[PDB]
């Protein structure tokens, strides 16, 4: 339930994080502010962290 | 030929190690003391080094 | 158009490089001086950088 003023401000992002073991990966779900991510391609949900 | 006081004390562990070139890999095995490794998944052949 | 003095001095090498993202790879090619590379394959076109 998002106040109109906040629509588009937050995005729910799923990513592949590294783990303690070099050969394993884990799925992580976290909430980012729109100001910290950028789109990559347009008309797609591929987003990356702003400073990479 | 392992005496009773050595049971189990040593383990013969194999793993996939990195090498000089990023697209190459090698199979390595070595002998570890039991005190340096910790079982992963309770009773299983899978183990990780104690400090990883 | 290579003069006689330069035959075998330069090679056109293609490789897969890392990118800004952990999951994305790029094909890169460049011109190397022969003195900077060492063949790993006998008759193959496989070479590696001199200091790896």
């Amino acid at each position, epitope marked *: 339930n998002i106040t109109d003023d906040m629509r588009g401000e937050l995005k729910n992002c799923s990513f592949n994080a590294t783990t303690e073991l070099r*050969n*394993k*990966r884990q799925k992580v779900y976290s909430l980012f502010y729109r100001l910290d991510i950028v789109p990559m391609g347009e008309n797609s949900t591929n987003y990356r962290l702003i400073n990479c | 030929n392992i005496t009773d006081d050595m049971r189990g004390e040593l383990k013969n562990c194999s793993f*996939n190690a*990195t090498t000089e070139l990023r697209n190459k*890999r090698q199979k390595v095995y070595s002998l570890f003391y039991r005190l340096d490794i910790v079982p992963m998944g309770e009773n299983s052949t899978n183990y990780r080094l104690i400090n990883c | 158009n290579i003069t006689d003095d330069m035959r075998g001095e330069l090679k056109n090498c293609s490789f897969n490089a*890392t990118t800004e993202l*952990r*999951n994305k790879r790029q094909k890169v090619y460049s011109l190397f001086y022969r003195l900077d590379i060492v063949p790993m394959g006998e008759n193959s076109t496989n070479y590696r950088l001199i200091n790896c």
Partner: antibody
Amino acid sequence: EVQLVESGGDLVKPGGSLRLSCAASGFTFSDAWMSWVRQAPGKGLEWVGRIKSNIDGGTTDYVAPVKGRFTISRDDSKNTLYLQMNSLKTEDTAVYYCTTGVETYDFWSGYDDHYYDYYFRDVWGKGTTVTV
Amino acid sequence: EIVLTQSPGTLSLSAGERATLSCRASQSVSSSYLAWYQQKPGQAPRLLIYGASSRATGIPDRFSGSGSGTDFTLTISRLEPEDFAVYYCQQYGSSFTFGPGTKVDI
């Protein structure tokens, strides 16, 4: 080695209820999507339904002819999958199986996800029944 | 739901022959969801191939398939005694329904 340890089969009539279930061994269900399929004697394979991992929402999908009377849930402690059936038809006689897809990606490095060993295992339970 | 049918209705091939089995979807389900399974009678079905391409781990390389729109297929390059089983295709066009099951016989 990965196994779905299936149990709960029994002798039932349409005028009753039955819960079938599978406990995992080796494989855990924290990231397991799972699905039930049934095969009536003399018939081919009919999908019953699917449950997504609770970490991805716990959403389920059911096949229209079996919807409502056949539902799917997950334990999340002892790795057990459940199929709860109630108020069944004479048409529901079948061997039911639990199935899952095991995806293993063993990476060659912790610095790039380019070179790795991908293994895909289709794991089935033994098959239990719903009788009439 | 998704309706899949098979052709030929039964296969009658000797071991060593190319036991090709095809199927058809009423729905134009993308090939990226195609799968085939081998069911030895009395056993749970075993996945051979998925994504109209990827082989399941442990499956012999005599098994390979392909497909596109409604036209999907499985090739056994050489039939072996281990293959005399019922084969099914599955098309996950938002539902994993299966075809009826086609027996490979001689």
